[PDB]
Amino acid sequence: MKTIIINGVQFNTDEDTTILKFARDNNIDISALCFLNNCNNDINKCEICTVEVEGTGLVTACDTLIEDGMIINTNSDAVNEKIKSRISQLLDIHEFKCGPCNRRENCEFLKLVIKYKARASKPFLPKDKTEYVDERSKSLTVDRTKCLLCGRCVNACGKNTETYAMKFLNKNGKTIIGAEDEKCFDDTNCLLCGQCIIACPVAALSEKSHMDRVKNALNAPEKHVIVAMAPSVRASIGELFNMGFGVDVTGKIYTALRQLGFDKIFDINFGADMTIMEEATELVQRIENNGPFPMFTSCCPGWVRQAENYYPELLNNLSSAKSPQQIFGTASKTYYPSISGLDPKNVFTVTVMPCTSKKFEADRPQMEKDGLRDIDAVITTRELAKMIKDAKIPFAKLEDSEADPAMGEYSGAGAIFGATGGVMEAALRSAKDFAENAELEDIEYKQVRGLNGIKEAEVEINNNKYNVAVINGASNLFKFMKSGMINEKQYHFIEVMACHGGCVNGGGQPHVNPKDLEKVDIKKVRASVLYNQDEHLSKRKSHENTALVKMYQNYFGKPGEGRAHEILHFKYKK
Ligand code: SF4
Ligand code: SF4
Ligand code: SF4
Ligand code: SF4
Ligand code: FES
């Protein structure tokens, strides 16, 4: 075995990890900053993980591997001053205004300021922040007075998407981060997925706020404000109210939304059953006569932008059904005004999403019908948590309430949408029933579920064999295509999500912090809430939702045709 004494404490091990990863497992904490996603900043490291090992001296723990004769120093003095110096040097390029900062109660730099008791030199107060700020994007915002240049957003974008859309740039003499040619992210190959925000330790990267759109709508006398939350929100916002991980808070969120002043409390899972209603019918129509194959999902805006910027020839193969957000939005300006006494231009639709790319989607020019936007505002999970906290709603102690039924009811098929393989499984439950005109008992497609990057399965429909694939994350779509895996058989239906794990690990989700992220498999525990909802729901197929059936029979007619085909669809030409 190898045998090391870190700070005079005895440890023998048959593990060949780094000093930082051995220490993380063994309670002895070493501080770190640029290390994340099994990588550090290769080009000018932050050196917060400095330790000293006798004989050699000061090394960076996040990438120095343990040796059998080591004696390592953490608390030390020469180590401790090398690190505190580094933090103070970052405060020289940091605007230290915690509160009103959106990262105040979970920062991880404020935490390294009070632990090492570091102070700037000259505190950094730019009189004009314009040059540092970029807010041209519909999904992402940058404030470089908070940027530590730790390279975490660049490495996270490369691992998670492989687009390398978040780059290190040379502006004048300085190094900044941003998009291709310091352009607005929307005008580049960027997917607006937000994984760079999730990797950022500070408030340098944030979602484009839609807080004032919601605010103004709630104070506006004539506006009827509709709110509907995504599948993933109920499996994750309780993390921000110190309730833990994998806690189902569906009922608390409906109550909280009533206390914020919303007029109707609906849900995007109703919209998810609507999308399956259209898309599963479209899949049956593509199986009747030979395609076009493959039909791809078109509900993830990060993926839609990936197939626009990188695979434009696939745009025709995408499902014409609108994403749950946008299909719900079209119906909230048409169906809901006809069952309530309202004029559609006084309805304002707000969604709560685990995603920043949803903001871009809602704001797309043609995502409207004669002046009325499908969706008027999209706030992330972190933004809903902010506005609950501002109102002082005692979230953890709220009584559970139910959604308003007409557009808030949902089946278990819609419920699993927030996990990778969720849309695939939900579409197959309805597509197999529609094509064979039966009510099938077996509905679990466990083989398309889970955290494997590329999952496939063979499905039998009408005693014929069909192949389906599930692409977990945008880096895996590039691997699927470039590998020629797409060509090893004829695929009939392919689900694609841009974020790894699915929407439960989207770019608008609660931050976690690495010394917690080490302990919890966050993609699995957030997803388990949703799968448990499906398993305990009596309706587990989209077409069985009672409020959905009332809407289609009384207002849209049959799926995939006539009126349903008119307004609940969107095709991308460009
Ligand atoms: S990013 Fe962190 S350290 Fe910087 S002002 Fe905000 S809360 Fe404070
Ligand atoms: S939003 Fe996604 S594709 Fe764009 S820079 Fe961030 S991680 Fe990269
Ligand atoms: S934007 Fe955030 S993650 Fe990216 S280099 Fe700056 S501080 Fe690091
Ligand atoms: S996987 Fe979900 S959270 Fe991620 S970009 Fe797509 S729609 Fe957004
Ligand atoms: S955490 Fe090790 S050099 Fe940055």
Give 521: exposed, middle or buried? Use CB within 10 Å, 0-12, 13-18, 19+. Answer: middle
CATH class of 1-124: alpha beta
Structural domain boundaries of the chain? 1-124, 125-208, 209-574
Task: Answer whether 152 contacts ligand 3 (Cβ < 6 A).
Answer: yes
Q: How was this structure determined?
A: X-ray
Nearest atom in ligand 1 to 95's CA: 5
What CATH number has the domain spanning 125-208?
3.30.70.20
DSSP state of 554: I
C-alpha 158 – ligand 2 centre gap (Å): 9
Task: Answer whether 46 contacts ligand 5 (Cβ < 6 A).
Answer: yes
| Burial per residue of 243-274, b for 16 or more beta-carbon CB atoms within 10 angstroms, e otherwise | eebbbebbebbbbbbbbbebbbbbbbbbbbbb
d(CA 527, CA 503): 9
DSSP state of 168: E
Residue nearest to atom 1 of ligand 3 (CA): 204
DSSP state of 65: B
Beta-strand relationship, 167-171 and 71-73: unpaired
Nearest atom in ligand 3 to 34's CA: 8
Pocket lining for ligand 4, CB < 6 angstroms: 193, 300-302, 354-355, 357-358, 497-499, 502-503, 506
d(CA 503, CA 354): 6
Is the CB of residue 310 less than 8 Å from the CB of residue 188?
Answer: no
Angle at 295 between CA 475 and CA 524, to 5 degrees: 45
Q: In the β-sheet with 205-207, what is the strand arrangement from edge to edge?
A: 133-134, 140-143, 205-207
Fold match flag (1-124 vs 125-208):
no
C-alpha 171 – ligand 4 centre gap (Å): 31
d(CA 443, CA 447): 12
Sequence ranges of the binding site? 34, 46, 49, 62, 94, 98, 101, 107, 147, 150, 153, 157, 190, 193, 196, 200, 300, 355, 499, 503
The encoded tokens of residue 303 equal 């993926």
Task: Answer whether 40 contacts ligand 5 (Cβ < 6 A).
Answer: yes
C-alpha 266 – ligand 3 centre gap (Å): 36
- Ligand index nearest the alpha carbon of residue 309: 2
Q: Rounding to the nearest 10 degrees, give the CA dihedral for residues 301, 306, 309, 315.
A: -80
User: Got the DSSP string for 316-385?
Assistant: TTB-SBPPHHHHHHHHHTTHHHHHSS--GGGEEEEEEES-SHHHHHHT-TTSEETTEES-SEEEEHHHHH
Angle at 558 between CA 556 and CA 564, to 5 degrees: 50
Nearest atom in ligand 3 to 200's CA: 3
- What is the chain's length? 574
Q: Which helix (H) or strand (E) holds 301?
A: helix 301-309
Task: Answer whether 157 contacts ligand 3 (Cβ < 6 A).
Answer: no
d(CA 476, CA 162): 9
For 117, what's the count of Cα atoms within 13 Å in the CB-facing half-sphere? 1
Overall resolution, Å? 2.4
DSSP state of 293: S
Give Cα 262 to chain centroid, integer Å. Answer: 24
* Maximum C-alpha span of the chain: 80
The encoded tokens of residue 493 equal 């239906």
Those residues whose C-beta lies under 8 Å from the C-beta of residue 278, and which sit 6 or more positions away, are: 319, 320, 321, 322, 327, 559, 560, 564, 568, 569
Cis-peptide, bond into residue 312, ω within 30° of zero: no
Task: Answer whether 149 contacts ligand 3 (Cβ < 6 A).
Answer: yes
C-alpha 157 – ligand 4 centre gap (Å): 14
d(CA 142, CA 515): 26
Q: Select from 134, 137, 188, 193 the residue to mutate for testing ligand 2; criterion: most ligand atoms less than 8 Å from CB.
A: 193
